[PDB]
Amino acid sequence: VRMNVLADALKSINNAEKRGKRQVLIRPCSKVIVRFLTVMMKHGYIGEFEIIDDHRAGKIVVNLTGRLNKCGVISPRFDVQLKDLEKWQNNLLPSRQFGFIVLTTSAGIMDHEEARRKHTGGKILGFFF
Amino acid sequence: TKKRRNNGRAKKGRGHVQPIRCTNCARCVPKDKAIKKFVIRNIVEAAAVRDISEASVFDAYVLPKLYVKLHYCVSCAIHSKVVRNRSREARKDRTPP
Amino acid sequence: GALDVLQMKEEDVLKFLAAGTHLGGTNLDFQMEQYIYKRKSDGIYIINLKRTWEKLLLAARAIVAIENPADVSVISSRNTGQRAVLKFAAATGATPIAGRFTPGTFTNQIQAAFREPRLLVVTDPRADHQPLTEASYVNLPTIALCNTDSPLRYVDIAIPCNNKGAHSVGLMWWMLAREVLRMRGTISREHPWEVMPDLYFYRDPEEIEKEEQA
Amino acid sequence: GRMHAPGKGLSQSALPYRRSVPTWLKLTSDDVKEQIYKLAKKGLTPSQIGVILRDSHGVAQVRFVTGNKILRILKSKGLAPDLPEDLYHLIKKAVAVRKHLERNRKDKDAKFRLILIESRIHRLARYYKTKRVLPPNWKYESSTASALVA
Amino acid sequence: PLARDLLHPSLEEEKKKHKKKRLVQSPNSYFMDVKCPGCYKITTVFSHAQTVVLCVGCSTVLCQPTGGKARLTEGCSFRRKQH
Amino acid sequence: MRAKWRKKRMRRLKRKRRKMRQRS
Amino acid sequence: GKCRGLRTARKLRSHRRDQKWHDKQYKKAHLGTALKANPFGGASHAKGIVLEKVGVEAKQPNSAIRKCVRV
Amino acid sequence: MQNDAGEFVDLYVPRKCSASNRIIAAKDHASIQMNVAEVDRTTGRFNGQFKTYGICGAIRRMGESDDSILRLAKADGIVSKNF
Amino acid sequence: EWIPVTKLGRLVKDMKIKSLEEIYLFSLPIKESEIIDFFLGASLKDEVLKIMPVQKQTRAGQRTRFKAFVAIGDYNGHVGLGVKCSKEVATAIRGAIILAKLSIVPVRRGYWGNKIGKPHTVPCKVTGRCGSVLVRLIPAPRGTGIVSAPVPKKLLMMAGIDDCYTSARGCTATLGNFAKATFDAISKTYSYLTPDLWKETVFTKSPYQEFTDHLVKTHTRV
RNA sequence: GAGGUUCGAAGACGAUCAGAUACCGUCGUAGUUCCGACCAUAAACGAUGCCGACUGGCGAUGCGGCGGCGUUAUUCCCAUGACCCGCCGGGCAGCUUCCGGGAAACCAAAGUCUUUGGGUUCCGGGGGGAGUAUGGUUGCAAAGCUGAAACUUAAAGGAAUUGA
RNA sequence: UUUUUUUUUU
Numbered sequence A: 001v002r003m004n005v006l007a008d009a010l011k012s013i014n015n016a017e018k019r020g021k022r023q024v025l026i027r028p029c030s031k032v033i034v035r036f037l038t039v040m041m042k043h044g045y046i047g048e049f050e051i052i053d054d055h056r057a058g059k060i061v062v063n064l065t066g067r068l069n070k071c072g073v074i075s076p077r078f079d080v081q082l083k084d085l086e087k088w089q090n091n092l093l094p095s096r097q098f099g100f101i102v103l104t105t106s107a108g109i110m111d112h113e114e115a116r117r118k119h120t121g122g123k124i125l126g127f128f129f
Numbered sequence B: 001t002k003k004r005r006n007n008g009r010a011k012k013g014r015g016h017v018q019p020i021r022c023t024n025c026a027r028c029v030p031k032d033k034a035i036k037k038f039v040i041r042n043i044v045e046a047a048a049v050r051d052i053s054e055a056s057v058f059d060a061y062v063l064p065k066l067y068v069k070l071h072y073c074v075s076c077a078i079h080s081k082v083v084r085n086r087s088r089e090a091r092k093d094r095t096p097p
Numbered sequence C: 001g002a003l004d005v006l007q008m009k010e011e012d013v014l015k016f017l018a019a020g021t022h023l024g025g026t027n028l029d030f031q032m033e034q035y036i037y038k039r040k041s042d043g044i045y046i047i048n049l050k051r052t053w054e055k056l057l058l059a060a061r062a063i064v065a066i067e068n069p070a071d072v073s074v075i076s077s078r079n080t081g082q083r084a085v086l087k088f089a090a091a092t093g094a095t096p097i098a099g100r101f102t103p104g105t106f107t108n109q110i111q112a113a114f115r116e117p118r119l120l121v122v123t124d125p126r127a128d129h130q131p132l133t134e135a136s137y138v139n140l141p142t143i144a145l146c147n148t149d150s151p152l153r154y155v156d157i158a159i160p161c162n163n164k165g166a167h168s169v170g171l172m173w174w175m176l177a178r179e180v181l182r183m184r185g186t187i188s189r190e191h192p193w194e195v196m197p198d199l200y201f202y203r204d205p206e207e208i209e210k211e212e213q214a
Numbered sequence D: 001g002r003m004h005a006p007g008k009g010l011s012q013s014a015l016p017y018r019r020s021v022p023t024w025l026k027l028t029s030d031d032v033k034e035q036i037y038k039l040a041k042k043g044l045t046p047s048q049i050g051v052i053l054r055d056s057h058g059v060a061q062v063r064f065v066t067g068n069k070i071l072r073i074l075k076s077k078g079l080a081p082d083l084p085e086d087l088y089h090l091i092k093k094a095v096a097v098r099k100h101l102e103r104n105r106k107d108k109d110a111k112f113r114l115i116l117i118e119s120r121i122h123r124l125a126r127y128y129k130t131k132r133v134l135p136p137n138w139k140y141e142s143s144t145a146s147a148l149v150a
Numbered sequence E: 001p002l003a004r005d006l007l008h009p010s011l012e013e014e015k016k017k018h019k020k021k022r023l024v025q026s027p028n029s030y031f032m033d034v035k036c037p038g039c040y041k042i043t044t045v046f047s048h049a050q051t052v053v054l055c056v057g058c059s060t061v062l063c064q065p066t067g068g069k070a071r072l073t074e075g076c077s078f079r080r081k082q083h
Numbered sequence F: 001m002r003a004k005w006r007k008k009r010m011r012r013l014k015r016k017r018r019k020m021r022q023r024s
Numbered sequence G: 001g002k003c004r005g006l007r008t009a010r011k012l013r014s015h016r017r018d019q020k021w022h023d024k025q026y027k028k029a030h031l032g033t034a035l036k037a038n039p040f041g042g043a044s045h046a047k048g049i050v051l052e053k054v055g056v057e058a059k060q061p062n063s064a065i066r067k068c069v070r071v
Numbered sequence H: 001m002q003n004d005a006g007e008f009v010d011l012y013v014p015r016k017c018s019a020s021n022r023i024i025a026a027k028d029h030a031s032i033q034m035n036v037a038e039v040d041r042t043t044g045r046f047n048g049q050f051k052t053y054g055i056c057g058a059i060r061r062m063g064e065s066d067d068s069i070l071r072l073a074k075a076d077g078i079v080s081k082n083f
Numbered sequence I: 001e002w003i004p005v006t007k008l009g010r011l012v013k014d015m016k017i018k019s020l021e022e023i024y025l026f027s028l029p030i031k032e033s034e035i036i037d038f039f040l041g042a043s044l045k046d047e048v049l050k051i052m053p054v055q056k057q058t059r060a061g062q063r064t065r066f067k068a069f070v071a072i073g074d075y076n077g078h079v080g081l082g083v084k085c086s087k088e089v090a091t092a093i094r095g096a097i098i099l100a101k102l103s104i105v106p107v108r109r110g111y112w113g114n115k116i117g118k119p120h121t122v123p124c125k126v127t128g129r130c131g132s133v134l135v136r137l138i139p140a141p142r143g144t145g146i147v148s149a150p151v152p153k154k155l156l157m158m159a160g161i162d163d164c165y166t167s168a169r170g171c172t173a174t175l176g177n178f179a180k181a182t183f184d185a186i187s188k189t190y191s192y193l194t195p196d197l198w199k200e201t202v203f204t205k206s207p208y209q210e211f212t213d214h215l216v217k218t219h220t221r222v
Numbered sequence J: 001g002a003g004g005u006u007c008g009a010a011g012a013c014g015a016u017c018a019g020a021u022a023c024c025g026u027c028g029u030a031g032u033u034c035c036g037a038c039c040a041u042a043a044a045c046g047a048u049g050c051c052g053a054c055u056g057g058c059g060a061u062g063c064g065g066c067g068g069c070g071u072u073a074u075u076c077c078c079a080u081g082a083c084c085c086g087c088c089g090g091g092c093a094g095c096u097u098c099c100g101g102g103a104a105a106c107c108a109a110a111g112u113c114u115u116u117g118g119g120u121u122c123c124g125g126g127g128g129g130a131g132u133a134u135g136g137u138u139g140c141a142a143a144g145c146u147g148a149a150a151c152u153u154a155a156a157g158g159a160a161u162u163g164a
Numbered sequence K: 001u002u003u004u005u006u007u008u009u010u
C-alpha cells in the first residue's frame, strides 16, 4: 500500500516547513532516509534529528530551521551516469549557486558534487534547495 | 454551472423520492423539491364570519377551521406569485417572515 | 517580566478577582488554550492570572518602547470601552477615536481624518475588526485585549482578559496605564497610583442619570 | 485498507516495548508448554489456544516467555494439523455459505460473498504453494471442500 | 501552535491519545489478580478478556466478557498489578 | 435537432436501411 | 495517474502509439487514406485539361462571382 | 551577495522573521517590527535599550505571531521561566 | 514644488533618507510618487504596453474606457508595473506611470556559473502566477540576451536583467496576466530564501524611531 | 405460468382554441404484482476512479471502547437501563475560514503541481461527419457492445462583467 | 384565449 517511504518522508517534511512549524514526525525510518538527512546536515538545510526505536521500522523526529524551500523525490531510481548528471542539474536545480541532487552512488549515498569528485554515478533518489 | 448548491431539492443523501401532484396544474414533482405549505383558512371569511355568527344558535362555542395541505411545483409556483425570484446573495435564505 | 521588582503582588489579585477578568467565557480558542488553567462546571474557562500579568508586562514593554506619545492611537467601537479608551488616551497621550471608525483612516491619505499611528491598542478584535483589517495595510503593530474566543486575526500581541465584563475592561486599561507609567518613570513604583480604576469604567446612561439625581 | 471491503479499520495488537517476561509471572516454560499440550489434545486452534493462555493462566506472550512460536512448538512435535488454520476456517465459512446457497438460490448477496471468499482461499493457497506449506498439486474445489472441513 | 514537543509529549496528552500513534506503542490493558468472596485462590486475569474465567476452587465465574473490559462479579475485588 | 428526437430519426433511418439490405 | 515505473517502457510506447491514433494530423497522414482521397494524389501540381468555365458565388458576407474552371 | 573577487555586490539585505526565518517581502504591508523595551533589574525603569522582533506578514496573518513572540521573549529572558 | 503629506514623504524632502533600499527593508508602504521621482527621476524610463478599449452594454449602449499598462525602470536594479482604467487615453497613461512608480519593487540579481564580473541573471529560476499564466524565469549564461515575448523582454531589460530565458504556460496573449505573472516571479527572487541570506539580519532602527523629533516638528507645522 | 385491487403506454370518448395528432376529465389493453430465463439502460450525478503519507479548527450525529459531578427507573445495595460532561478509532455530514489551489462559479480536497516523479487502471486530444457506414458478436424483436473513412467548418464551447 | 416573419455585406 506504501510503495515508497523516502518519498513520503520528503513530502511530509516539505508539508511541515510550508506551514512554518519547528519539528516533523516521520512514522517510518529507513537507513536510506537517514543517509539523506546526513547530506541535509552538512549542507545546512535542516537541524539535528533523532530516531525513536519502537522496534517497528523506527520513527524520526526532525528539527527544522525553516531554511529549506522544496525537497523532492525521483521515485523511479533512474540510472544517472557522469555524462547525464550535469543534465539533471540544469533540469532540476534552481541554480548552480546552491541546491543539491542526491543519488545512491556505489560509494554510498552522496550529493552530486561529491559524485563528480568521486567520478562515480548511481541511481538518482531526490533533491533539495 | 450550479445555480443551486442543493440542486433545488432537499435530497442529498438518498437516491429516490415519491412524487406528489401539483395543485394548480396537476403535474408530478418530487415532494422535497416542491413548494409545500400549510394553509389554515377559517371556514368563513373574517368579514363574513359576523353574518353567520348573528344567525348562529351556539353561545359562541363554534369556530371551525379549514386546514388544507398545499403543493405547488416550481413552474406554477411563480404564477401563484409565491417564490418570487431572488437576488444573487438572496438565494441563500430561509423562512420569510 | 522575570525581575523580582516586577514580581506579583497581592492587591492586584483582589482587583482581578473582583472585576472578573479570570472567567472569560465558554468558547475556547485553539491558539488561546495555553493561557487557560482549566474550566469550571459552567464551561467557564478560568484564565491563569500569571499569564495575564506576563502578557500585560510584555504589552507594556511595547508601549514604553515608543518615544512619541502623540504617535500612538486608541480605538473604541463598543461604548463600554470608550471611556477607558478615552482616559488612556488622555493619560499617556494616545489619540482617541470613538463611535464609528470611518473607512480610510489608515489607508486613505486624502481626508482630514487620516491617521498613521506607530502603535494601537485594541479592546476586542471582534468589535474592532475594521481597524484591525485596516491595520493589515499599514503594518501597524497592535496590542489586543484578547478573550478566550477573540479572533486573533492580524494580531501582534495578546493579553488574556474578559472583554465581555464592563469592570474587567476598565480595570485592565487602568492597570496597563499604571504599568507603563511605573515603567517610564513618570509615576513611581514605590507607591500605589492615586487615581481610582473606576475612571475607566463606562456606565449606562440610565444609571448615570439615577446617580446624578441622587 | 481491507482486501475486499472499503474499511479503513485500525485495530491490531500493540505489543509492549518490554520484551522481558514480567517478574510477577510465577510460571515456568515447561508449564506453559504443558498447558499448550492440554489445549492441543483437546482439539483447539492455536488462535484460541493463545487467547485462552492470555485471558486465564497469566501468559502475556508465548513467544516472549519461551522463545518459539505456538505453531513452531506444535510443528516440531508433529501433531499440528496439515491444513493451516486460517486456510481451514475460510473453507468452513464458504461451506456454510454454500449450505445456505443450495437452500436458497435466490440470495444473490450470498453468491457474491461466496465468490469473494473463494478467491480469499485461492490467493492464500497460491502463497502456501510457493512456501511449500501444502503440496503444489493441492487444489480447492467445491466438491472436495466438504471433505476438507471437519 | 507552531512548536509542540514531539520528542517529549506530555504524559496527559500521551495517555489521552490512542494506543497507537504514540512515541512507543504500548497496551492500554493490564494484568490484575482476582480475589473472589468465599475463596482463597488468587487468579490472574488480563484486561480486555474474551473467554470465560471460572475459578477452580470457588466453582464460580469471575468475569463475563460483555464488550470491552471483562465485567466481573459484584463481590470480587480488583487490584491492578504492575502499574 | 433536439438531442433525443435526432436519435429517434437516426434509429428510424437505420431500421429502414436494415430492411433494404435484407430484401437485397 | 500515468505510470512511472522503470520497467513499463513498452507500456509507454504502446499507450503513445494507441493514443497517437487520436489527433487529426498524425492519423490523416499515416493511414494512407487521405492520399488516396485527394484528387491530387499527393501532387503539388498537375497537368489537366480545361473543360468548363463556371462562376461560383462567394461566401455569405461577400457578394462576388469567382471565375472557376472545371478541370 | 558576493562575487568571486570578494566584493559585496548587492542592492540591499532585507530582514527576516525571527520565528519563520523567511524573507519579509518588500511590499509585505502586514509585517511588523515590534520593539520590546528593557528595564533594570532593581530600578524597573526604561534604560533606553530595546529588543527587536521581526514578524513576517503571513505569520501574523495566520495567527502564530502571539505564540512566536512569547517563545522568543521567554528565551531571551524577558518572560518569566515559570510562565 | 512638492508638499509631503505623510511620514515617509517628509523624510524624503528633508534628506533624512539616503535611498529606497532602507524602505524595502522595513516593508513600509509607499504612497507618493515624488519619493521615486526625487531619487531616480533622471534615470527612470517608462513604456506603455497596451490600450484595449474596454466598454459595456446597457440600456444606453457602448462607452469605451481606456486601460493603460506601463512598466517603469532604470534598467539597472528597480522595476515595477501599474495599471489604470479611466475615460481618456492620456489620463490613463499618466496615472498608470504614477502607480507603476508607486509599486516599484527591488529586483534581486545574481550570477550564473562563474561568479566573476557583474550580475547579469537571476539568483535562481523562479515562478509567478496570475490567472492561468505561469511565467518561469531561467538563469542564462553571459551574453545570451533575453528569450521571451517582446513585452516581457522589455520588462526584463527595464528591470535591468541582462540575460534571461523564459518559459510560459498559459494564455500569454493576455498581456496583463503575462506581465503580472513575471513580476510576481521577479518579486519572488529577493523573497527567495537562498543560502547567502541565511546570515542573521542585524535589526536596524526604523526610520520612524531613528527620526522622531523631526517627524513631530514637521507634523506640528502641518 | 398464476389474477387483475389501485394506477396507468397504446386506444377510445368529453372540453379549449384557426388547426391540438397534447396538456384537463372518464374509462381503459399491454404494463404496474409474484415466479424462471432473457434483455444491461438511465441525469447507474457527488455531471467528482481505487490504494497509500502529510496536511487548521468549531458546534453536532451513528457504532464500539474508556473516565466521571450529578438527575432519573428497575429497588433495598452494586449492577442494568436513560440524560450531561469529555477522550479515543472507524464514518455520513454542515458551518466559518487569506491553509491552499482554481478560469471562475465554488471546493480540507476540486491541497500538498514548473519549487513539475507515492502506485496504477479506465478514459480525452478543435467543431462536425458520427455513435454514422462496414465487419464481428449478443438478442424473439426493439436494439446493445466494438467501431472508421471520405468530406466540411474559424469557430463551438466554460466561467464571469453590466442591461433587457 | 392567441401576437408568425423582417432583408445583404456594411
Ligand SMILES: [Zn+2]
Pocket (backbone or CB within 6 Å): B022, B023, B024, B025, B026, B027, B072, B073, B074, B075, B076, B077
Ligand atoms: Zn404546477
